[PDB]
Amino acid sequence: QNFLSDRRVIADIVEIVSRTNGPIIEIGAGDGALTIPLQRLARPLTAVEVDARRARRLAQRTARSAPGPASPTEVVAADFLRYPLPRSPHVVVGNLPFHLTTAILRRLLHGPGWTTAVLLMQWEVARRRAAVGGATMMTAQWWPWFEFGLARKVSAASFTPRPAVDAGLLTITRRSRPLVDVADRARYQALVHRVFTGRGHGMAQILQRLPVPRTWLRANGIAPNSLPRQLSAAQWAALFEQT
Numbered sequence: 001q002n003f004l005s006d007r008r009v010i011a012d013i014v015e016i017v018s019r020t021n022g023p024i025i026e027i028g029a030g031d032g033a034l035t036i037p038l039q040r041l042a043r044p045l046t047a048v049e050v051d052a053r054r055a056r057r058l059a060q061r062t063a064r065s066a067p068g069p070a071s072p073t074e075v076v077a078a079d080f081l082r083y084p085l086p087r088s089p090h091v092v093v094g095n096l097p098f099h100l101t102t103a104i105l106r107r108l109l110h111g112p113g114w115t116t117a118v119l120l121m122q123w124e125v126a127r128r129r130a131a132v133g134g135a136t137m138m139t140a141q142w143w144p145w146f147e148f149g150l151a152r153k154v155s156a157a158s159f160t161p162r163p164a165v166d167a168g169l170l171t172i173t174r175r176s177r178p179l180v181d182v183a184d185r186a187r188y189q190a191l192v193h194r195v196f197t198g199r200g201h202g203m204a205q206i207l208q209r210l211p212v213p214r215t216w217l218r219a220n221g222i223a224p225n226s227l228p229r230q231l232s233a234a235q236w237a238a239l240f241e242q243t
């Protein structure tokens with residue numbers, strides 16, 4: 001496991017979390033590198049840590065730095081993949097174990113209540129999720145319900161011990177107005193898969209060899225030679241409504 005040792009990254013994450021509202025849930029709290037600074041935001045906090053011995057040590061540390069028994073942070077010894085997320089508004093934050101990143105992201109994207117997620121993960125994953133240099137199939141598949149932001153790059157030297165690759169700080173925000181109804185999620189995500197894996201050179205050829213009016217692409221501001229990665233969230237949703 002790679003614990004966050006760079007205090008500047010801690011300050012940066014706390015700065016982003018401080019601009020949000022409501023209760024906070026932290027994934028992989030560890031020794032409390034983020035938990036202790038997050039508790040000073042005076043908001044309700046739940047810190048999740050799968051190592052029970054480490055979770056008990058963290059519960060003592062959070063209580064010691066808290067105003068006292070009468071006033072704070074609940075430390076839960078649990079696997080976040082099995083943790084029931086509340087359906088009420090909350091904010092999620094975490095330094096994710098790099099081998100469980102996509103499973104944790106899947107669990108969060110299908111989960112309720114949370115309005116913002118502030119997550120530390122592998123740099124290549126955070127880059128693809130934030131659509132740096134164009135969107136990937138997974139980003140476009142979640143775009144009607146969420147927005148992704150790349151806050152910063154984080155060197156492997158900012159962790160102890162050092163991971164094999166660098167990291168990225170990713171923000172995710174739940175759209176208050178979804179672009180596609182959640183009931184149509186599986187058909188929407190199937191269409192996005194079909195376009196990213198379809199044969200053809202460019203959108204005009206891809207949409208031809210697929211099970212769309214020929215005037216549709218240019219009327220929606222899409223160049224016929226464009227690649228699926230160049231489409232915006234609004235264009236994917238218009239394509240879903242069309243098909």
Ligand SMILES: Nc1ncnc2c1ncn2[C@@H]1O[C@H](C[C@@H](N)CC[C@H](N)C(=O)O)[C@@H](O)[C@H]1O
Pocket residue numbers: 001002003004005027028029030031032033034048049050051078079080081095096097100
């Ligand atoms: N599935 C899980 N659910 C909740 N915690 C996890 C899970 N898997 C790993 N853990 C913990 O996730 C943490 C991930 C670490 N990269 C960071 C820990 C901590 N925030 C620190 O920076 O001090 C480790 O403390 C792991 O023990």
